[PDB]
Amino acid sequence: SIPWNLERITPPRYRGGSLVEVYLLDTSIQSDHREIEGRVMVTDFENVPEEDASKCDSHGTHLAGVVSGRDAGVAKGASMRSLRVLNCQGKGTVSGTLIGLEFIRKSQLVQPVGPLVVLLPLAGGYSRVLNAACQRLARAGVVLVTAAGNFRDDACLYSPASAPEVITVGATNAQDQPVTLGTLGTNFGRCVDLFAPGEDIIGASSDCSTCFVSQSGTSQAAAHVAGIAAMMLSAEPELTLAELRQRLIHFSAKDVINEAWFPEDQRVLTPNLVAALPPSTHGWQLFCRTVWSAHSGPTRMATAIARCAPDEELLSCSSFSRSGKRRGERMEAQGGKLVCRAHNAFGGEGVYAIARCCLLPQANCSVHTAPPAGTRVHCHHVLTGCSSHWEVEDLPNQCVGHREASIHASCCHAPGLECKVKEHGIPQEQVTVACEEGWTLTGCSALPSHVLGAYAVDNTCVVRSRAVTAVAICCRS
Amino acid sequence: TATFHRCAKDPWRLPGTYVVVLKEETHLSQSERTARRLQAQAARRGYLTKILHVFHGLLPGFLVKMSGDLLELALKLPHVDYIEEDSSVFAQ
């Protein structure tokens, strides 16, 4: 009887959302449906384009039901407030959405409450202004959850999906595979933060006050995460956006998606995570996440930059190009904060910078660099990361690089933190080495035969080549 | 330095309405003055305009219904950061 999706997000050990308010920007809703009655407030903010009643509130009623519905909702408690920015045909405007986001912020300023989650179950093309408005609202301290989009395409080409600081959610089905329906399906790529159930999701039907219907979409998926986030914020009202994101990632089911469903170049960029509620089991823990930059593009002096959130520390920095035409990467300071920068080679199509960004309070971190010598540098403190860059066209708390390369060590003073290094090598397109259960991968690199790059996937260090050796630095309290 | 942007998916564009985004610290009073100035400069050129909304609280700026002919003029207004043509969003 438990809907498959609600079972899917239930942790392996288990026992909400009322201190939290969830805003919904959508079609009109049937607020008298028994799933949501008395739990959703209709603001009557409305900004929708002209067309070109049961059907009118179908989309919105279902999602309000996914988030907070008493029988089939994720966060059965939760309070919701609804804004109408989609018309009866489900169409809205960027300007209308902006006006809506502004309305939420004015409400907050006029009558402050607790943590806010804003669900944006909608998409248009890439919009500079819409992305900026989302970012600005995130920086004001509001959590935004958005749909990845339903076009079986790169989510970075859509808004608010591509919008920095917003949690972007793709949809997976009952077999934990990405939803695909012909030429349509879940979006994917590096702008997607995680996936959640978004096929065959039962919820409130606006046909009648007690009816139910199954719907599919990245909106349904985003609604699961809004519910999950609302529960997480009730339990821990002080979470920063970076902390909430690290928890959503940490508690997801990992490596459950068959990545063959995604286009080849998007596999590496797309996180293999299906959202789930935190367990009853939760003492301090080291949380890290992998942040891929935008591709640098092909200019000769091109650089890709991957950054961490203000409250995170950059513990390592790696890079990757599909061609292998790469000048490596370096950790460089910037506004008093370290970023991961990767360098394209002359004739390269471009490269990615790949940061490992971690929540490490009490950390004092620095970088130690040595110019081309092989080349070596050490933390003379724990080593959390090695990087290397070169300027040539071709070839023990210690990092070792190629003789023609500069080498950079990320060194932190973090008492109460233990780190070890685990190595693995073979004759090979991909070599792999994982931290032990309960350890957090902080750094991933290849021993210095021609590598495309290296990256952490959860707690597994992956090295890609064309005698290769993967090296993982793993830490815990 | 002010730039123009419109949706790359041509069918999703909504020409004739523009979001005028002003520089970050621009004050509401200035946003309003800038909108009126646009309306005046347009009117002297024979163009009707309508200010649909003035933005403040996240981004400063305004929403304006006008011919795209006026975009060169509008990009030269004081405080302008960029202008974006309105476009469609959809239930997912």
Binding site: S58, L184, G217 | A91
Partner: peptide, 7 residues
Amino acid sequence: XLFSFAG
């Protein structure tokens, strides 16, 4: 691609 993938 609105309403369960235009389904």
